Design a protein around this ligand. Structure first.
Ligand SMILES: [Zn+2]
Length: 93
DNA sequence: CCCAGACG
DNA sequence: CGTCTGGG
């Protein structure tokens, strides 16, 4: 049972990192685990976003397999090479 | 004022 | 789904 993760340039300035609970700026690289919001299970499965760094603090709780690296962050390939590199560094080996 | 579309 | 607001 793999977690389903995603990467992308934030679509707007109105989402909030789940790790630090700070607002993510439009345009910034952001990672998501799609899952159920505790306080809103009514919604069911939804995107929960993270600053890449904050995402990594919680790599384990989130269900990230360092064995598969970045391939499991659906949409990685769409990112600029610059960004694809920076990201790949932080991800645990 | 409006409302698509982002978010939770 | 209801809410909010960026960009008309
Ligand atoms: Zn954060």
């Amino acid at each position: 049972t793999l977690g389903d993760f995603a990467a992308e340039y934030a679509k707007s300035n109105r989402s909030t990192c789940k790790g630090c609970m700070e607002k993510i700026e439009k345009g910034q690289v952001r990672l998501s685990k799609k899952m159920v919001d505790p306080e809103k299970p009514q919604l069911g499965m939804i995107d929960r976003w993270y600053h890449p760094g904050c995402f990594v603090k919680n790599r384990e709780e989130l269900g990230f397999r360092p064995e598969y690296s970045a391939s499991q962050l659906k949409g990685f390939s769409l990112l600029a090479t610059e960004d694809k590199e920076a990201l790949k560094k932080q991800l645990p080996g």
